Amino acid sequence: IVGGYTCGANTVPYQVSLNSGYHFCGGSLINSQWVVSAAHCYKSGIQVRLGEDNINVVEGNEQFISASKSIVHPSYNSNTLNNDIMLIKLKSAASLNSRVASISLPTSCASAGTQCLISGWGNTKSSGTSYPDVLKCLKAPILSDSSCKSAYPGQITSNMFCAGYLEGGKDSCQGDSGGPVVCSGKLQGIVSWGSGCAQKNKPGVYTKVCNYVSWIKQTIASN
Ligand SMILES: FC(F)(F)c1cccc(CN2CCc3[nH]cnc3C2)c1
Ligand SMILES: [Ca+2]
């Protein structure tokens, strides 16, 4: 997250870190056994780390649970990033408490202008590289479809939305991939892509979660 703020420990209780020897992606806990992330975060050997603040220090609220199955969306295209969504099932159910909690799926899509919270352990620099230990947060509005399409000619599908600031300075970034965009207490987006980070006229692009609720629910119901 570039241009954000320190969230505060366990203030984003649905935020997960995906770990394969190191943090490599975020995700969102959606029930005691399932995490939503980006399809571009797929790899084998995932350990889901819940209750994290400092990802380099065991602070006492963590739960570390290995993935038993990952399911990349059937229509994910890794070239275009269309349908950039994945489900990860935990080997055992997370213990839910104030600091480890699931985030509700949307019942309806969110409109341009809606204020959201984006979070992660990604790069905090727009030029250069610095990776934080503690969770970073950014408040950002959803941008209009027309301005998203203007920013990224030929690249925005109906399964994507832009959020952030056309002036630059505030954005998600590398390492935030797969993490949450939460608006009015619902998971509306997944950190998907951009062109660099925090550049003028290049806002972050997010997977449009509301389009996938049926798929998520029926996948969970049979897996
Ligand atoms: F794993 C990487 F690094 F190869 C990768 C591939 C595709 C996408 C991404 C995530 N985006 C990075 C740029 C950006 N700018 C605003 N948001 C993002 C997220 C990472
Ligand atoms: Ca920790």
Tab-separated table of C-alpha atoms and ligand atoms in Angstrom:
chain	number	residue	atom	x	y	z
A	1	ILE	CA	0.000	0.000	0.000
A	2	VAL	CA	1.428	3.353	-1.097
A	3	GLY	CA	0.306	6.494	0.713
A	4	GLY	CA	-1.709	4.612	3.339
A	5	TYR	CA	-1.628	4.429	7.112
A	6	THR	CA	-0.803	1.836	9.730
A	7	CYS	CA	-4.092	-0.007	10.306
A	8	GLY	CA	-3.466	-0.997	13.905
A	9	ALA	CA	-3.053	-4.562	15.111
A	10	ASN	CA	-5.978	-6.846	14.263
A	11	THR	CA	-8.232	-3.982	13.206
A	12	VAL	CA	-8.846	-5.724	9.846
A	13	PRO	CA	-9.776	-9.131	11.229
A	14	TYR	CA	-10.654	-10.746	7.886
A	15	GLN	CA	-7.244	-9.923	6.365
A	16	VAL	CA	-5.046	-12.959	5.791
A	17	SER	CA	-1.433	-13.353	4.722
A	18	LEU	CA	-0.646	-16.217	2.334
A	19	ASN	CA	2.743	-17.649	3.236
A	20	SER	CA	4.965	-20.066	1.303
A	21	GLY	CA	8.095	-19.496	3.396
A	22	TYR	CA	7.408	-15.730	3.241
A	23	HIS	CA	4.386	-13.503	2.729
A	24	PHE	CA	3.438	-13.408	-0.977
A	25	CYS	CA	-0.236	-12.353	-1.175
A	26	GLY	CA	-3.197	-11.232	0.823
A	27	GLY	CA	-6.634	-12.776	1.082
A	28	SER	CA	-9.954	-12.429	2.888
A	29	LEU	CA	-11.521	-14.874	5.339
A	30	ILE	CA	-15.124	-15.459	4.250
A	31	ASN	CA	-16.091	-18.232	6.686
A	32	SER	CA	-14.275	-20.429	9.206
A	33	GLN	CA	-12.866	-22.689	6.451
A	34	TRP	CA	-12.491	-20.535	3.332
A	35	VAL	CA	-10.389	-17.663	2.035
A	36	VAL	CA	-10.918	-15.555	-1.120
A	37	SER	CA	-7.831	-14.315	-2.952
A	38	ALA	CA	-6.661	-13.476	-6.494
A	39	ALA	CA	-6.138	-16.254	-9.044
A	40	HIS	CA	-2.749	-14.714	-9.848
A	41	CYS	CA	-1.780	-15.662	-6.252
A	42	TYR	CA	-2.115	-19.374	-7.054
A	43	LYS	CA	0.774	-21.644	-6.069
A	44	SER	CA	1.149	-24.911	-4.174
A	45	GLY	CA	2.284	-25.110	-0.523
A	46	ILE	CA	0.185	-22.279	0.878
A	47	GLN	CA	-0.078	-21.667	4.602
A	48	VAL	CA	-2.838	-19.238	5.534
A	49	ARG	CA	-1.860	-16.877	8.352
A	50	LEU	CA	-4.777	-15.323	10.211
A	51	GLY	CA	-4.690	-12.799	13.045
A	52	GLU	CA	-1.514	-11.167	11.739
A	53	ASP	CA	-0.194	-7.696	12.296
A	54	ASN	CA	3.606	-7.850	12.188
A	55	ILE	CA	4.215	-10.712	9.741
A	56	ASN	CA	7.795	-11.163	11.017
A	57	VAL	CA	6.979	-11.494	14.748
A	58	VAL	CA	4.734	-13.943	16.595
A	59	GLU	CA	2.607	-11.496	18.591
A	60	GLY	CA	0.045	-13.909	20.030
A	61	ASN	CA	-3.153	-13.673	17.979
A	62	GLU	CA	-2.058	-15.654	14.933
A	63	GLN	CA	-3.543	-18.841	13.581
A	64	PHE	CA	-1.418	-20.671	11.012
A	65	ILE	CA	-3.428	-23.173	8.945
A	66	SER	CA	-2.322	-25.000	5.795
A	67	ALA	CA	-4.483	-24.992	2.680
A	68	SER	CA	-6.098	-28.329	1.786
A	69	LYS	CA	-7.360	-27.222	-1.632
A	70	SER	CA	-7.196	-24.209	-3.896
A	71	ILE	CA	-9.722	-23.532	-6.632
A	72	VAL	CA	-8.842	-20.997	-9.311
A	73	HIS	CA	-11.875	-19.600	-11.130
A	74	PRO	CA	-12.699	-21.810	-14.141
A	75	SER	CA	-12.519	-18.825	-16.507
A	76	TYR	CA	-9.412	-17.108	-15.145
A	77	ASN	CA	-7.208	-15.769	-17.939
A	78	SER	CA	-3.686	-15.021	-16.690
A	79	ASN	CA	-2.877	-12.757	-19.667
A	80	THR	CA	-5.826	-10.373	-19.269
A	81	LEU	CA	-6.460	-11.073	-15.564
A	82	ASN	CA	-10.149	-11.516	-16.346
A	83	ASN	CA	-11.826	-13.492	-13.521
A	84	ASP	CA	-8.905	-12.939	-11.139
A	85	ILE	CA	-10.330	-14.839	-8.186
A	86	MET	CA	-9.425	-17.999	-6.272
A	87	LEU	CA	-10.834	-19.872	-3.273
A	88	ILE	CA	-8.619	-21.559	-0.691
A	89	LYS	CA	-9.947	-24.115	1.780
A	90	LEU	CA	-8.275	-24.432	5.173
A	91	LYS	CA	-7.255	-27.868	6.505
A	92	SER	CA	-8.994	-27.006	9.790
A	93	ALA	CA	-11.540	-24.363	10.747
A	94	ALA	CA	-10.225	-21.073	12.076
A	95	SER	CA	-11.289	-20.102	15.567
A	96	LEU	CA	-13.381	-16.968	15.115
A	97	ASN	CA	-13.035	-14.101	17.584
A	98	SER	CA	-12.828	-10.269	17.527
A	99	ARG	CA	-9.376	-10.385	15.909
A	100	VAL	CA	-10.064	-13.206	13.444
A	101	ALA	CA	-13.402	-12.779	11.718
A	102	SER	CA	-15.017	-13.410	8.368
A	103	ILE	CA	-16.104	-10.633	5.992
A	104	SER	CA	-19.577	-10.736	4.430
A	105	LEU	CA	-19.997	-11.254	0.702
A	106	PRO	CA	-21.944	-8.551	-1.117
A	107	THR	CA	-25.641	-8.988	-1.879
A	108	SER	CA	-25.397	-6.146	-4.373
A	109	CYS	CA	-22.584	-4.471	-6.276
A	110	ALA	CA	-21.089	-1.155	-5.116
A	111	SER	CA	-21.307	2.091	-7.081
A	112	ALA	CA	-18.696	4.612	-8.135
A	113	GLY	CA	-18.099	7.019	-5.278
A	114	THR	CA	-18.484	4.351	-2.587
A	115	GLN	CA	-15.785	4.599	0.064
A	116	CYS	CA	-13.774	1.436	0.660
A	117	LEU	CA	-10.913	0.113	2.778
A	118	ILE	CA	-7.981	-1.564	1.031
A	119	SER	CA	-5.299	-3.319	3.088
A	120	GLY	CA	-2.121	-5.327	2.815
A	121	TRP	CA	1.571	-5.891	3.420
A	122	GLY	CA	2.652	-4.811	-0.061
A	123	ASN	CA	5.272	-2.322	-1.192
A	124	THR	CA	4.869	1.161	0.301
A	125	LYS	CA	6.945	2.929	-2.402
A	126	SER	CA	5.835	4.087	-5.884
A	127	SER	CA	9.453	4.415	-6.984
A	128	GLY	CA	11.775	1.976	-5.268
A	129	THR	CA	10.893	-0.778	-2.841
A	130	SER	CA	10.084	-1.028	0.857
A	131	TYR	CA	8.038	-3.799	2.402
A	132	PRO	CA	6.359	-3.210	5.743
A	133	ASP	CA	6.096	-5.558	8.674
A	134	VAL	CA	2.724	-4.331	9.911
A	135	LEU	CA	-0.554	-4.145	8.041
A	136	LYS	CA	-1.196	-0.986	6.001
A	137	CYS	CA	-4.568	0.503	5.134
A	138	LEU	CA	-5.934	2.889	2.526
A	139	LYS	CA	-9.340	4.533	2.282
A	140	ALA	CA	-10.268	4.932	-1.386
A	141	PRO	CA	-13.360	5.509	-3.494
A	142	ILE	CA	-14.583	3.335	-6.333
A	143	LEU	CA	-14.105	5.176	-9.632
A	144	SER	CA	-16.594	5.388	-12.488
A	145	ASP	CA	-16.476	2.744	-15.191
A	146	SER	CA	-15.854	5.445	-17.798
A	147	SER	CA	-12.837	6.847	-15.946
A	148	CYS	CA	-11.484	3.328	-15.326
A	149	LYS	CA	-11.780	2.539	-19.051
A	150	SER	CA	-10.238	5.895	-19.968
A	151	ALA	CA	-7.266	5.133	-17.698
A	152	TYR	CA	-6.775	1.648	-19.169
A	153	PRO	CA	-7.988	1.548	-22.790
A	154	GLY	CA	-8.857	-1.952	-23.937
A	155	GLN	CA	-8.175	-3.630	-20.567
A	156	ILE	CA	-11.167	-3.219	-18.243
A	157	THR	CA	-13.730	-6.005	-18.349
A	158	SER	CA	-17.116	-6.232	-16.651
A	159	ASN	CA	-15.347	-8.229	-13.897
A	160	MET	CA	-13.094	-5.333	-12.898
A	161	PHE	CA	-13.375	-1.943	-11.256
A	162	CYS	CA	-10.961	0.843	-10.468
A	163	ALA	CA	-10.573	2.444	-7.066
A	164	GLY	CA	-8.228	5.100	-5.792
A	165	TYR	CA	-7.061	8.496	-6.872
A	166	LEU	CA	-6.413	9.710	-10.405
A	167	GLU	CA	-3.961	12.308	-9.053
A	168	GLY	CA	-1.665	9.520	-7.852
A	169	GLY	CA	0.073	9.039	-4.527
A	170	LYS	CA	-2.321	6.520	-2.932
A	171	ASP	CA	-2.752	2.956	-4.248
A	172	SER	CA	-2.318	-0.740	-3.635
A	173	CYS	CA	0.929	-2.261	-4.881
A	174	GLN	CA	2.987	-5.447	-5.304
A	175	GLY	CA	2.430	-7.805	-2.372
A	176	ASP	CA	-1.095	-6.480	-1.759
A	177	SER	CA	-2.344	-8.906	-4.464
A	178	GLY	CA	-5.328	-10.953	-3.403
A	179	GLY	CA	-6.233	-8.730	-0.471
A	180	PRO	CA	-9.548	-7.110	0.400
A	181	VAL	CA	-11.446	-4.085	-0.780
A	182	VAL	CA	-14.229	-3.690	1.794
A	183	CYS	CA	-17.050	-1.196	1.397
A	184	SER	CA	-19.904	-0.782	3.881
A	185	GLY	CA	-18.899	-4.029	5.603
A	186	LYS	CA	-18.914	-6.153	2.417
A	187	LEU	CA	-16.085	-7.610	0.369
A	188	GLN	CA	-16.523	-5.811	-2.969
A	189	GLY	CA	-13.046	-6.192	-4.433
A	190	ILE	CA	-9.837	-8.176	-4.562
A	191	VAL	CA	-6.487	-6.489	-5.242
A	192	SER	CA	-5.807	-7.536	-8.832
A	193	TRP	CA	-3.560	-5.272	-10.932
A	194	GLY	CA	-2.441	-1.829	-12.022
A	195	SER	CA	0.273	-0.116	-14.002
A	196	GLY	CA	2.990	0.475	-11.446
A	197	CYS	CA	1.614	1.890	-8.187
A	198	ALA	CA	0.243	5.308	-7.249
A	199	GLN	CA	0.987	6.812	-10.666
A	200	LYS	CA	-1.116	9.650	-12.055
A	201	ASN	CA	-4.116	8.400	-14.078
A	202	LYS	CA	-3.285	4.758	-13.278
A	203	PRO	CA	-5.526	3.721	-10.375
A	204	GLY	CA	-5.636	0.214	-8.946
A	205	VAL	CA	-7.824	-2.379	-10.644
A	206	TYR	CA	-9.840	-4.812	-8.550
A	207	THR	CA	-11.784	-8.005	-9.165
A	208	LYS	CA	-15.522	-7.273	-8.978
A	209	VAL	CA	-16.535	-9.738	-6.229
A	210	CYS	CA	-20.283	-9.228	-6.579
A	211	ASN	CA	-20.126	-11.035	-9.958
A	212	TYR	CA	-18.779	-14.169	-8.247
A	213	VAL	CA	-21.047	-14.623	-5.237
A	214	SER	CA	-23.055	-17.449	-6.824
A	215	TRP	CA	-19.861	-19.285	-7.796
A	216	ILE	CA	-18.361	-18.774	-4.337
A	217	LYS	CA	-21.459	-20.048	-2.548
A	218	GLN	CA	-21.955	-23.124	-4.724
A	219	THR	CA	-18.233	-23.961	-4.629
A	220	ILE	CA	-18.221	-23.825	-0.833
A	221	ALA	CA	-21.439	-25.896	-0.695
A	222	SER	CA	-19.817	-28.804	-2.567
A	223	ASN	CA	-16.182	-28.665	-1.411
B	1	LIG	F1	2.909	-10.984	-8.645
B	1	LIG	C1	3.162	-9.948	-9.489
B	1	LIG	F2	3.977	-9.057	-8.857
B	1	LIG	F3	3.810	-10.407	-10.590
B	1	LIG	C2	1.827	-9.306	-9.882
B	1	LIG	C3	1.212	-9.591	-11.112
B	1	LIG	C4	-0.013	-8.995	-11.450
B	1	LIG	C5	-0.629	-8.105	-10.556
B	1	LIG	C6	-0.011	-7.817	-9.328
B	1	LIG	C7	-0.645	-6.867	-8.309
B	1	LIG	N1	-0.704	-5.442	-8.676
B	1	LIG	C8	0.642	-4.810	-8.765
B	1	LIG	C9	0.536	-3.393	-9.381
B	1	LIG	C10	-0.617	-2.710	-8.724
B	1	LIG	N2	-0.988	-1.335	-8.688
B	1	LIG	C11	-2.044	-1.200	-8.012
B	1	LIG	N3	-2.432	-2.360	-7.570
B	1	LIG	C12	-1.588	-3.282	-7.988
B	1	LIG	C13	-1.633	-4.759	-7.733
B	1	LIG	C14	1.205	-8.420	-8.997
B	2	CA	CA	2.777	-12.023	13.484
